[PDB]
Amino acid sequence: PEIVDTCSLASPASVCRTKHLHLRCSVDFTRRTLTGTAALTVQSQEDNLRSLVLDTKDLTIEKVVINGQEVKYALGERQSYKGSPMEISLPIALSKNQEIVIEISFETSPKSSALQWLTPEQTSGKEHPYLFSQCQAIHCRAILPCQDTPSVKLTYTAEVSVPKELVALMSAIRDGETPDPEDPSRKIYKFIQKVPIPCYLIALVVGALESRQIGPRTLVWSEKEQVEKSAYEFSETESMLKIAEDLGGPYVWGQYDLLVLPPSFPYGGMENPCLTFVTPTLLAGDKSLSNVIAHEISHSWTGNLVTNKTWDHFWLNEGHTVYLERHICGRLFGEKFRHFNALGGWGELQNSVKTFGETHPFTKLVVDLTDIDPDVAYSSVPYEKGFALLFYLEQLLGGPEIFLGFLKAYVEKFSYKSITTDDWKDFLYSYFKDKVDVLNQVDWNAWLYSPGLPPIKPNYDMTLTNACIALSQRWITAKEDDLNSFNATDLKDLSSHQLNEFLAQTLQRAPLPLGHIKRMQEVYNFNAINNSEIRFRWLRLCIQSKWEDAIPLALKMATEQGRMKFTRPLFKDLAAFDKSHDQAVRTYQEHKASMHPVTAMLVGKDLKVD
Numbered sequence: 017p018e019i020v021d022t023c024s025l026a027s028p029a030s031v032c033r034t035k036h037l038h039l040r041c042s043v044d045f046t047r048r049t050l051t052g053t054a055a056l057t058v059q060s061q062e063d064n065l066r067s068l069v070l071d072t073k074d075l076t077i078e079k080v081v082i083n084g085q086e087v088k089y090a091l092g093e094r095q096s097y098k099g100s101p102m103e104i105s106l107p108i109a110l111s112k113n114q115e116i117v118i119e120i121s122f123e124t125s126p127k128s129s130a131l132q133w134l135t136p137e138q139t140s141g142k143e144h145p146y147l148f149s150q151c152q153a154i155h156c157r158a159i160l161p162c163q164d165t166p167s168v169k170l171t172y173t174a175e176v177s178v179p180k181e182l183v184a185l186m187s188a189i190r191d192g193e194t195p196d197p198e199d200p201s202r203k204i205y206k207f208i209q210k211v212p213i214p215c216y217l218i219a220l221v222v223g224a225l226e227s228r229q230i231g232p233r234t235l236v237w238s239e240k241e242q243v244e245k246s247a248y249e250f251s252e253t254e255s256m257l258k259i260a261e262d263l264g265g266p267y268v269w270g271q272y273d274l275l276v277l278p279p280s281f282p283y284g285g286m287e288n289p290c291l292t293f294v295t296p297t298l299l300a301g302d303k304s305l306s307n308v309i310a311h312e313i314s315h316s317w318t319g320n321l322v323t324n325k326t327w328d329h330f331w332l333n334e335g336h337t338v339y340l341e342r343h344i345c346g347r348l349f350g351e352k353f354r355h356f357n358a359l360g361g362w363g364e365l366q367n368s369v370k371t372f373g374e375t376h377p378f379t380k381l382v383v384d385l386t387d388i389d390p391d392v393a394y395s396s397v398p399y400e401k402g403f404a405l406l407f408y409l410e411q412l413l414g415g416p417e418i419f420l421g422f423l424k425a426y427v428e429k430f431s432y433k434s435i436t437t438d439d440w441k442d443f444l445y446s447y448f449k450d451k452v453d454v455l456n457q458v459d460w461n462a463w464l465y466s467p468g469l470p471p472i473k474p475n476y477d478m479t480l481t482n483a484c485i486a487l488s489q490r491w492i493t494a495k496e497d498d499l500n501s502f503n504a505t506d507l508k509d510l511s512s513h514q515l516n517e518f519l520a521q522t523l524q525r526a527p528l529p530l531g532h533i534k535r536m537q538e539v540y541n542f543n544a545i546n547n548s549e550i551r552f553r554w555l556r557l558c559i560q561s562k563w564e565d566a567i568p569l570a571l572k573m574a575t576e577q578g579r580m581k582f583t584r585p586l587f588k589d590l591a592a593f594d595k596s597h598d599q600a601v602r603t604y605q606e607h608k609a610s611m612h613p614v615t616a617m618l619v620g621k622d623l624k625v626d
C-alpha cells in the first residue's frame with residue numbers, strides 16, 4: 017500500500033510536498049536562539065487541499081503568513097520525541113500540483129535537540145561562542161517547521177545574520193556576505209542549495225572559523241587551533257572524490273568542503289551537502305582515519321542523491337555508502353585492504369548482534385520504527401549487515417566490476433528520489449535480468465527481515481587479518497610462561513589498522529586476566545597511542561579487564577570528546593566496573609548540562625539516570 021513515515025507527524029508526501037525553503041534568521045548567542053522566518057513553497061498532491069500539518073519540536077511560532085496575510089494554525093500536544101504537529105489552514109483550497117508559499121515566523125528553544133550552543137570556555141579559542149546543528153534523523157523539526165521526513169526533497173536558499181566577528185556556514189554553496197544593514201555589529205551570510213535534498217541534510221554552524229584550501233573544490237574549516245592539523249589529515253580528499261566520481265558518476269553538489277567541529281560532535285561525520293562535518297577525533301596525525309572522509313564523500317551519491325524514503329530503510333543509505341567507502345579505500349590502498357576492512361566490518365556486526373541479542377528487532381536489516389526514537393535504535397547493523405548483503409551479492413553476481421556497474425546504474429536511476437528496499441530489490445532484478453536464477457538463490461527473507469547474523473557469510477581475503485589473529489589468539493590463550501616473551505617487537509610490521517583490529521579481536525574475548533593487560537601496556541605502551549579508535553578499544557579492554565589504573569584515562573576520554581561511538585561504550589563499561597561505577601555516574605551528572613543534547617539523553621538512558 018502506502019509506505020508510512022512513522023517518525024513524522026507532518027502531512028505525507030502523498031498529500032503535499034515541500035519544494036523549496038527560503039530561510040531568513042538571526043543567530044543570537046546571548047539568548048541561544050535562532051529567530052527568523054521559514055518560507056516554504058508547498059505543492060499539493062490532491063484536489064481540494066485546505067490544510068496541512070508540519071512537524072515542530074520546541075518551537076515558538078509567532079505567526080504564519082500566506083500571501084501577505086496571517087492565517088490560522090494550531091499546535092497539537094507533544095508526542096514525545098516526535099515533537100508537536102502544526103496544522104496550518106490554507107486561505108484557498110489547492111488542487112493537484114498547485115503551489116502556495118507559507119511563511120512561518122519562529123524562534124528555536126535553547127534546548128533545541130538539533131543544536132548545541134557552546135560557551136566560549138567550550139571552544140578551542142576560549143574567546144567566542146560556537147553553534148552547530150545535527151538534524152539527522154529527525155531534529156530538523158527542532159530548528160524550523162517542516163515535513164520532517166526523508167520522503168520529501170526540497171531546494172533551499174538561506175540568509176543568516178551573525179555577530180560580525182563570527183562565520184556562518186551551511187549545507188549549501190556560499191553566496192556571499194555583507195553587513196547586516198538592519199542592525200550593524202551583525203553580518204549576513206547567504207547560501208544557495210539548488211539540488212533538492214531531504215530536510216535532515218539542512219545544516220548550520222556559527223563560530224570563529226578559518227579555512228585552508230586543500231583541493232580545487234575543497235576548503236577545510238575549523239577554529240584556528242585545528243586548521244593546520246586538519247589540512248594535513250584530510251589531504252587525500254580530492255583524490256577520494258575523484259575515485260568516488262568514477263564509481264558513482266558525477267559529483268553534482270559543486271563544492272565539497274569539510275568542517276572539523278568541536279569534540280562534542282556526536283558522530284564520526286555528517287554528510288551535509290557541500291559541507292561534510294567531521295569529528296576532531298579523526299585527527300590522528302597520520303591520515304589513518306581517512307575512511308570516515310571516504311564514507312561521507314560516498315554519501316554524496318548514496319544517501320544524498322538516492323535517499324531512503326523512511327528511516328525503516330536506513331540500510332539503503334548506509335550499506336551502499338559503506339560499500340562505496342570500501343571501494344574507494346581499496347582503490348587507494350589495495351584490494352587486500354578492502355577485504356581487511358570488510359572483515360573487520362563483519363566483526364563489528366558480530367559485536368552489535370551480541371550487544372542487542374540475536375533475536376532483537378533492531379538487528380533486522382529493514383526495521384519498524386513505529387513508536388521507536390531513531391536515536392535509540394541507531395547501531396552498526398544497517399552499516400554492516402547492509403554492507404555484508406552487498407558484498408555477498410558482489411561475489412554471487414560476478415565480482416566488483418560487475419556489481420559496481422549495477423551501483424552506478426542504481427544511483428542514476430534513483431537520483432533525486434527517495435526509495436524503499438523494494439525499489440532497490442526490484443531494480444536489482446531488473447538490472448540483473450540475465451541472472452534472475454542466481455538472484456533467486458538469495459535467502460531474501462532472512463537477509464532483509466530476520467534478526468541476527470546474516471544467513472551466509474561472504475568470502476574474505478585474509479592477508480592482512482592473519483597477523484592480527486595470531487597476536488590476538490596468543491594473548492587470549494596466554495599463560496604465565498608466555499608473558500615474558502611478548503615484546504614490542506610483536507608490533508613491528510603492523511599498521512595502525514592492524515593494531516586496532518588486534519585490539520578489536522582481543523576485546524571480543526574480554527576480560528583478559530589483569531596481569532595480562534598490565535603486561536600488554538608494559539610491552540606495547542598502548543597508553544601512549546592517541547589514535548582514537550585504538551585508544552577507545554584499548555581503554556575498553558582495560559576497564560573490562562578490571563584495571564583500576566585505566567579509570568581516569570577512560571573517564572577522561574569519555575568526557576573530553578563526545579563522539580557517541582566512543583563516549584557511550586566508555587561510560588557503559590565504567591558503569592559496569594564496580595570500582596568506577598559511582599564516579600562514572602557522578603561524572604555524567606556533572607557534565608550533562610554541557611554535553612550535546614542527544615548524547616546527554618542517550619548516556620543518561622545507558623547509565624539509567626533519572
Ligand SMILES: N[C@@H](Cc1ccc(OCc2ccccc2)cc1)CN(O)C(=O)CCCCC(=O)O
Binds near residue numbers: 334391393394
Ligand atoms: N549519517 C551520518 C551519521 C548519522 C547521523 C545521525 C543519525 O541519526 C540516527 C538514526 C538515523 C536513521 C535511523 C536510525 C537512527 C544516523 C547516522 C554519517 N555517517 O553515517 C557516519 O559518519 C558513519 C561513521 C560512524 C562513525 C561515528 O562514530 O559516527
Ligand SMILES: [Yb+3]
Ligand atoms: Yb517572544
Ligand SMILES: [Yb+3]
Binds near residue numbers: 123
Ligand atoms: Yb524570544
Ligand SMILES: [Yb+3]
Binds near residue numbers: 495
Ligand atoms: Yb606454556
Ligand SMILES: [Zn+2]
Binds near residue numbers: 311315333334
Ligand atoms: Zn553514513
